[PDB]
Each structure stands twice: as C-alpha cells, then as structure tokens.
C-alpha cells in the first residue's frame, strides 16, 4: 500500500490525508489549535488584536502542531515507509519571517528532538499576519499609487491591492518594524514555510500561491520589480525565484527518515495555497467552475487567459502553469438564504424548495439583489427588488422572493465570472459544494443559469486531497504529463442537475438585464 500524503496548514488546524496509488483516501488525522495547543490563547486559531484589524497566528504553534500530528500518526501505527511523496496546502497570503541564520538550524535538524525545540529562535516575527488581517489599507493605497493605479496593479498581479495580500503585509512590517525586516533573511508563505519544514531547507514559493501577494507578474511568472520596490527594499532576495507548482523541490529531510521512518527517496512536491489545492482536489479543467456555498459563497474558475479586474483574484493555475484560475468572493451567502427562508417560507427548506418548483425560470421578470451586509463582488449594500417593468418595488410575494434570491445569486456568479474572461463551453461542468448543494432545487437553478450540468462533491478535505493528487502528479511525470490524466482514477462527483429545456433562451435575455440593474445600483452608490 504505497501512498502520498496531502497536508493542509489551515487557519484552525493542521490536517493530513494519506491517499493510495489507486487514489483512495484511507487515512486522515488532524491537530486543532485552540483545542490541542490552548496555551497559545488563540480563538479560531488566531489572535484578533486590540485595533480589531490586525489578525495573527504564532508561527511556533504551527511548528508544534506538525510535531504533534507526526507523533499522533506514529502512535496510531501509520506506516511512513510506504510514503512515496508528499505535498500540501497553506492558508493563503499569511507570511513567515525567518531570522538571519535560520537556514543553518533547518539544515542541521537532529532526529532526537522535536521541530519546535530546534526552531525556537528562527523567526524574526513571532505573530504572523494571516488572511483575516485588514490592517494595511494605507499600504494598499500606496502600492496602487506607486504602480499607476488599482487597474494597473490588477493587470500585473491578477488583483488590485487587498489588505490580506502579502506585499501589503510585508510593507507594513518594513514600515513599523524595520529592524525585524532587515534581520529577515527569508520570507515564506504558509504553504512554502510548511514545505521548508519537510525539506529541512528553504522551499521556493510556487506560481499559484505566489499570485496572492500583489508581487508576482502572473503572465511572465517573475516578481514585479515595481511592486517589490513599492513594498520594501531588498525583497526579491528574501523571496527567491518562484517555481511552477508541479516542481519536486527536494527529497524529504533525513530528519523525517530517521525520526519517523519515511523512505529516503520520499519526494517533496512544491506546496500551494489552499484554494489552488482545492481546485486540484476538485479536478477542475478548462471550461469548469466550482461554487462553494456557505457563510461566504466562493466561485472557483478555470481561465485560459486572464482579464484581471477591480474585483476577484486571478492566480497562476496550480495544475497547469501556462494557464490561470480565479476566485470571486461573495459575502452575502448562506445567511441571506436562511433569512429569506425564515421570512418568506416559514423557516422550512422544504417550502423553500417548493417555492422554486412553483415558479418559472426567469421569475416572470422579477429580479432581486440581497445584500444585508456590504457585498465585495461588487461593492453594494441593501435589498433591491425590481418588477417585470424594471420598476423598483418594496417587496415580492414569498415564492417570487425565494427565486429572486437564488436566481439573482447565480446570475451574479455568471456575470462576474464572465467579467474575468470565463466562458461556458460545451465541455463545462459545474461543481457545487457546501450546505445549499444539499438542495436539488437550488442546484437546478444553478444548472439553468449556466446552461451546464451540475455535480455535487464533498470538499471537507479538498485541500488535503488536492495536495495528495499533486504529489502523485509529481511522481507520475510532473510537467511531462497532464494532471487530468493522473487523477482520472479518482472518484467522480455525482450528477445533481442538468439545464431544463428553454433555460438558454430565458437567461440569454435576463442576464444582460440583471447586469444593467447591477450597474444602475452601483452608479447610485
Ligand atoms: O484569503 C483567502 C482567499 O483569498 C482565504 O480563502 C484563505 O486562503 C483561507 O485559508
């Protein structure tokens, strides 16, 4: 039973899965931060600082969690000698600042001791900024002004400046703690930091997670000199050149061979971001999209060429370094669906489904926007309802309200996807996951709006599983072979809905009208 390990250095936990050569998951284990390392005093794996904007995690908690999980696997009888390769994912954007002299500690690890004891003094910043941080608005405005504006920054790096993006965090550390910055020999993402621990040497950053920093020129796949210089001096030397995501960055350290029994030939394939790893785990291809439904709704897009915008995030693709992917984030998700259910259909998901069944595609021309909190994609707030004549109305009948919400949410996803260059193709598959993917009637609207089949997939471990798939891709030939050919053996998602006859005619006319009403609301602010 030869296998690969797929790791996930997440916000709240470190998780691992073991996947066999037939691409079956047969083992899973985790270490949860608040529960298993309570002495760090985190809540949800992080520290929200007094300003209410700075959000960090202790780097040595992440190292100690790796020690705990490897010892927990060993105590359970995990056979490490069967591990051919490993890869992993890191929560995106978060950064690690390695102190001058730290690589000497990494390359001289003794198997008699734990990682935490030996790496105790290796970090110039103890509290790492994570993806939840929103304390760098001044640095975002500075970076955009330095390179010719928000659109110029987006053309270049796939995104305008976002507070959590690494370049803005590095700029803030340079500005506020120049002594710690000047004593930093290396800056890693959570992904490349975790890979470095397994290598026992510094791992490079991959193209895909490297695209979440407002630093990488996504098309030429080199660091932007203009972005680097606007964030902090001598930054290129601290990052090192980025690499294709499907790169063998080295063999596992002899530390793991000797301490846990990994075979000496065990390969370490470059780590990537959790969203890129989930795209690999979901096995998206050209023409495909994934809709992750939850408190936030997240759209995962495959893109052959990028059309970066003031919304969304375009990254280099982790399973095909010549192409791209995108994320579009929607803040009004499952809480809006629950509120409409409670207000209009007696708090019943069965009546919610009946409302969709009892209304026609296109909802008689009744259109709605439902943003109780400020939306990200695009920046609108409020509930905005329009009747068949495009007149603004105060309310809808309950069944019309349910369909307006669901149709509107999915039409918004299509319009904003298409704004980044996405197009539905004949081969297109739609992957749906999360709470609302357990509602066939919701998935039917999604199929109708995109005029493409919808498949349901469990993604509780998608970043772990995607990481193990990427490790197998490395072993199967890497860049010499297509990722999709390696993972054809993995279990297929199940078909939940196909577009109803006439869907194409309904939404070809309604999508432009929804897009114009959205522009009307944005122009009135
Ligand atoms: O910040 C982002 C994406 O831009 C989150 O999805 C984190 O990657 C979660 O760990």
From Swiss-Prot:
E.C. code: 2.7.1.17
Catalytic activity entry: D-xylulose + ATP = D-xylulose 5-phosphate + ADP + H(+)
UniProt-listed SUPFAM superfamilies: Actin-like ATPase domain
Annotated residues for binding of substrate: 93, 164, 274-275
GO BP terms: carbohydrate metabolic process; D-glucuronate catabolic process to D-xylulose 5-phosphate; D-xylose metabolic process; generation of precursor metabolites and energy; xylulose catabolic process; xylulose metabolic process
Chain positions recorded as ATP binding sites: 349, 435-436, 439
Top-level enzyme category: transferase
Record has Transmembrane as a keyword: no
Single GO cellular component term: cytosol
Pfam families (UniProt xref): FGGY_C (PF02782), FGGY_N (PF00370)
Entries under Gene3D superfamilies matching the protein: 3.30.420.40
Alphabetical keyword list: ATP-binding, Carbohydrate metabolism, Kinase, Nucleotide-binding, Transferase, Xylose metabolism
Family (UniProt): Belongs to the FGGY kinase family.
Quaternary structure note: Monomer.
Role: Phosphorylates D-xylulose to produce D-xylulose 5-phosphate, a molecule that may play an important role in the regulation of glucose metabolism and lipogenesis.
Protein's UniProt name: Xylulose kinase
Species, as recorded: Homo sapiens
């Amino acid at each position: 039973r030869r296998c690969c390990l797929g790791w996930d250095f997440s916000t709240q936990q470190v998780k691992v899965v073991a996947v066999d050569a037939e691409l079956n998951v047969f083992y899973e284990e985790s270490v949860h931060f608040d529960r298993d390392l309570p002495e760090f005093g985190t809540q949800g794996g992080v520290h929200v600082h007094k300003d209410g904007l700075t959000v960090t995690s202790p780097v040595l908690m992440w190292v100690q969690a790796l020690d705990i999980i490897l010892e927990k696997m060993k105590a359970s009888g995990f056979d490490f000698s069967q591990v051919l390769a490993l890869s992993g994912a890191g929560q995106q954007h978060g950064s690690i600042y390695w102190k001058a002299g730290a690589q000497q500690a990494l390359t001289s690890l003794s198997p008699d001791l734990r990682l935490h004891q030996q790496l105790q003094d290796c970090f110039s910043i103890s509290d790492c900024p994570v993806w939840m941080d929103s304390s760098t608005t001044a640095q975002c405005r500075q970076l955009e002004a330095a390179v010719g504006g928000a659109q110029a920054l987006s053309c270049l790096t796939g995104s305008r400046a976002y507070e959590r993006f690494t370049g803005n965090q590095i700029a803030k550390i340079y500005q506020q703690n120049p002594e710690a910055y000047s004593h930093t020999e290396r800056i890693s993402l959570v992904s490349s930091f975790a890979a470095s621990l397994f290598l026992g040497s510094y791992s490079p950053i991959d193209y895909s997670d490297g695209s979440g920093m407002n630093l990488l020129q996504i098309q030429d796949k080199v660091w932007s000199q203009a972005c680097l210089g606007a964030c902090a001096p001598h930054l290129e030397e601290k990052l090192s050149p980025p690499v294709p995501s499907c790169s063998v960055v080295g063999a596992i350290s002899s530390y793991y061979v000797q301490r846990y029994g990994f075979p000496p030939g065990c390969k370490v394939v470059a780590f990537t971001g959790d969203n890129p790893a989930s795209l690999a785990g979901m096995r998206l291809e050209e023409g495909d999209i994934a809709v992750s439904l939850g408190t936030s709704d997240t759209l995962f897009l495959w893109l052959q060429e990028p059309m970066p915008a003031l919304e969304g995030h375009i990254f280099c693709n982790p399973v095909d370094s010549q192409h791209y992917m995108a994320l579009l984030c929607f803040k009004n998700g499952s809480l809006m669906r629950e509120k409409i259910r409670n207000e209009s259909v007696s708090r019943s998901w069965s009546d919610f489904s009946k409302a969709l069944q009892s209304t026609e595609m296109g909802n008689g021309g009744n259109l709605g926007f439902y943003f109780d909190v400020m939306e990200i994609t695009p920046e609108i707030i409020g509930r905005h309802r329009f009747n068949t004549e495009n007149h603004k109305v105060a309310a809808f009948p309950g069944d019309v309200e349910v369909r307006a919400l669901i149709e509107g949410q999915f039409m918004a996803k299509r319009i904003h996807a298409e704004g980044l260059g996405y197009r539905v193709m004949s081969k297109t598959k739609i992957l749906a996951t999360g709470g609302a993917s357990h509602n066939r009637e919701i998935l039917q609207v999604l199929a109708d709006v995109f005029d493409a089949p919808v498949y349901v997939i469990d993604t509780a471990n998608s970043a772990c599983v995607g990481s193990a798939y990427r490790a197998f891709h490395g072993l199967a030939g890497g860049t010499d072979v297509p990722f999709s050919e390696v993972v054809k053996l993995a279990p297929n998602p199940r078909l939940a809905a196909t577009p109803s006859p006439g869907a194409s005619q309904v939404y070809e006319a309604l999508l432009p009208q929804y897009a114009k009403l959205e522009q009307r609301i944005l122009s009135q602010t």
